């Protein structure tokens, strides 16, 4: 794999969104890995409804938390709608997935990269934008302005974001806290420290969709 990966360059990443006051990070995170994998296969960059996953993921907890994997599992068993077809409302309603017609897209499965392994994660990212989790409940992470983030950080992962690339000293991550946070909505956390958990527990639970 190259020394530099940035799925944006390849036009596989949609603008940075703001989840507002919802614990729907897991949703935003999953939706990103979907918009990218679809771009890689189709060649068309589309935005998909995170609201759909927010309302319909029964294994998650709507705006009170959730899991990117179960959300991706829901897109491999049914599919997902366009974002404009199921606009984000920063709140959890009832699943309105049958009031919008067929799914704009669908995947064929979900896989979990080997946890606690920087290489394995890096390998996956090199192939497609990957969903990952980290510890965000920290003044340091919270107030991040730019540059390679090193912490201080804990491995008490409580936030789901999307890894859309990497460099020799970091991993490019797309957050869902609006473009006002970090580097225009993005953050580059440092890699290659020897810590299994990875800075902020970034190597704890990584998933990605499988599309043919």
Question: What would you note in describing this structure?
Answer:
Its EC number is 3.4.22.2. This is Papain. Cysteine proteinase with a high level of diversity in substrate specificity, an amino acid bearing a large hydrophobic side chain at the P2 position is preferred. This protein is an alpha+beta fold and 212 residues long. The chain has a single domain (1-212), classed as Cathepsin B, Chain A (Alpha-Beta Complex), CATH 3.90.70.10. Helix content is 23%, strand content 16%. It has helices at residues 25-41, 50-56, 68-77, 118-127, 139-142, and strands at 5-6, 110-112, 130-134, 148-149, 159-166, 170-174, 186-190, 207-209. The strands form 2 sheets. Strands 1, 3, 4, 5, 6 and 7 form a 6-stranded mixed sheet that branches. Strands 2-8 form a two-stranded antiparallel ribbon. Helix 1 crosses helix 2 (50-56). The longest helix is centred in the N-terminal third of the chain and has 17 residues, at 25-41.
Task: Please describe the structure with a list of short key phrases separated by commas or semicolons.
signal, allergen, alpha+beta, globular, 212 residues, 6-stranded mixed beta sheet
Quick structural overview:
It is built from five helices and eight strands, in the order βαααβαβαβββββ.
What topology emerges from the helices and strands here?
Elements: E1 5-6, H1 25-41, H2 50-56, H3 68-77, E2 110-112, H4 118-127, E3 130-134, H5 139-142, E4 148-149, E5 159-166, E6 170-174, E7 186-190, E8 207-209
Parallel strand pairs: 4-7
Antiparallel strand pairs: 1-5, 2-8, 3-5, 5-6, 6-7
Protein name: Papain
GO molecular function: cysteine-type peptidase activity; serpin family protein binding
GO biological process, one term: proteolysis
């Amino acid at each position: 794999i190259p020394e530099y990966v940035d799925w944006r360059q390849k036009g596989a990443v949609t603008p940075v969104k703001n989840q507002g006051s919802c614990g729907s990070c897991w949703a935003f995170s999953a939706v990103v890995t979907i918009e990218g994998i679809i771009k890689i296969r189709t060649g068309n960059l589309n935005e998909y409804s995170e609201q759909e996953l927010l309302d319909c993921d029964r294994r998650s907890y709507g705006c009170n938390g959730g899991y990117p994997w179960s959300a991706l599992q829901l897109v491999a068993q049914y599919g997902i709608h366009y974002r404009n077809t199921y606009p984000y409302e920063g709140v959890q309603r009832y699943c309105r997935s049958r009031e919008k017609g067929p799914y704009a897209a669908k995947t064929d499965g979900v896989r979990q990269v080997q946890p606690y392994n920087e290489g394995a994660l890096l390998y996956s990212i090199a192939n497609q934008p990957v969903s990952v989790v980290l510890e965000a409940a920290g003044k340091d992470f919270q107030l991040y302005r730019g540059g390679i983030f090193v912490g201080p950080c804990g491995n008490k992962v409580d936030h789901a974001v999307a890894a859309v690339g990497y460099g020799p000293n970091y991993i490019l991550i797309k957050n869902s806290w609006g473009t006002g946070w970090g580097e225009n909505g993005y953050i580059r956390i440092k890699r290659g420290t020897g810590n299994s958990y990875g800075v902020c527990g970034l190597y704890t639970s990584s998933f990605y969709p499988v599309k043919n």
